Amino acid sequence: PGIVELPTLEDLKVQEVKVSSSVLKAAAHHYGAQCDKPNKEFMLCRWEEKDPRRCLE
Amino acid sequence: WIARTFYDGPEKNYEKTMAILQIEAEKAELRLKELEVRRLMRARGDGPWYQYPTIDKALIDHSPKTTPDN
């Protein structure tokens, strides 16, 4: 019953972060300190909407 | 003499019979009504009777669950 709405493949295009896990771990603390605001907005949206399709931006 | 010292008048038995008949008729009507009410309550489940337990909703945990989608 009903049709599952999925975003187009164009909606899922973004410049990916192409570094491995060691590089991310080395800079994890400064990355958390500096990039806190967008990350916390995204996580609040993710835990409130409960839908991946509502949190793409 | 026998009637005076051993028995009462007809009206006593007459009215006692009336009271007894009223009580018995009320009881019969109540029994029929109770059977019908029991049938309706057991069929529908919308009355105080035949209430079978469901899970208490106070047991549900409403917290973030390490995963955004519950």
Ligand SMILES: CCCCCCCCCCCCCCCCC[C@@H](O)O[C@H](CO[C@H](O)CCCCCCCCCCCCCCC)COP(=O)(O)OCC[N+](C)(C)C
């Ligand atoms: C000339 C005479 C010719 C006629 C002879 C008549 C003989 C009479 C004997 C037959 C007695 C009939 C039995 C009656 C018992 C039940 C009736 C009972 O209801 O009456 C009670 C009265 O009880 C009697 O006293 C019972 C009498 C039984 C005793 C018989 C006498 C002889 C027996 C021998 C005893 C042992 C002898 C000693 C040997 C050593 C009072 O009850 P109550 O609910 O208020 O009545 C409401 C009506 N009111 C308003 C008028 C009062």
